[PDB]
Point group: C2
Chain length 180, copies 2
């Protein structure tokens, strides 16, 4: 029970089929660059600051190039993929090199400003861990969009006070990050 990302109870039901209906035809619009505006405590994100995720869609998957400042303060690039769950479940799997793959539900997105992302894993002792993100198309994110994400996470009983803001903005060397 001790870490704040280990939470009583089964992973939430999040109405995946409605979401998959909404999103499948708009995969093309989800490509491009997304900045990680905020996230809940995540022991698997190696990139601490200036997190910049670049998605290319190929018709079957997305290829991701994630860059930013690692926790030791150095530049870091991570290779990712985002593809339909291999068992035919109505969600995607997010898979990164030298890591593992997890379910990734887009709870809500307008494609042009924000996306609200959610992953959950169940334990055999009746608890779960989940990991949530707020993505923006820019370094900052208007309040109105931040509040949309807050509502979508509260709708599935994710405690939104768990979100922490990620360093973004003028202190980030994005232009270097894009060179890889």
């Amino acid at each position: 029970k001790i870490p704040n990302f280990v939470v009583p109870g089964k992973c939430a039901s999040v109405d995946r089929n409605k979401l998959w209906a909404e999103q499948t035809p708009n995969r093309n619009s989800y490509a491009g660059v997304w900045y990680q505006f905020a996230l809940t405590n995540n022991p698997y994100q190696l990139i601490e600051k200036c997190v910049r995720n670049e998605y290319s869609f190929d018709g079957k998957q997305f290829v991701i190039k994630s860059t930013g400042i690692a926790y030791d303060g150095n530049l870091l690039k991570r290779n990712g993929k985002l593809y339909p769950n291999p068992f035919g479940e109505p969600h995607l799997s997010i898979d990164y090199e030298n890591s593992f793959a997890a379910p990734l539900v887009i709870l809500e997105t307008d494609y042009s400003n924000y996306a609200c992302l959610y992953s959950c894993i169940d334990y055999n002792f009746g608890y779960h861990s989940d990991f949530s993100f707020i993505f923006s198309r820019s370094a900052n994110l208007a309040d109105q969009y931040v509040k949309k994400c807050e509502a979508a996470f509260k709708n599935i009983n994710v405690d939104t006070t768990r979100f922490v803001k990620t360093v973004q903005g003028s202190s980030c060397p994005y232009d270097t990050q894009k060179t890889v």
Copy 2:
């Protein structure tokens, strides 16, 4: 103050390239039924007792039907897949319906008696989590083979005192399990 499967330092090098080469020509021999003899503390495994994993190989991946008795005392079947890591890394991904996918290394096997399996993940805070397993072609497994896996795990710095025996034997309803 932390779980015994969260260990300081990084995942050790386990020479995957050598294993992968030895193992790609023998996929058909790895198919069939394997019984879980023992494992290290694993908060993801939903089957507690009588763990029986039936593998089928189709020429590109294994399809797995994993059955046994769940923590609640009911029979349980889980559908799983084991396929090459999607980035081209020299290990397999073990994937289960309604779960995540994780790297899985076959540290050692003779195909006809035993297999020693290993999964490890690095965190962002200077620790790793690893998950080890001893598999047998039968419900019991002779000391001769157990010792082989013990040596393999010790060779990669895993503390073998972490292994726990799984209930197997004439008490398990394997013929029911095989039927779903």
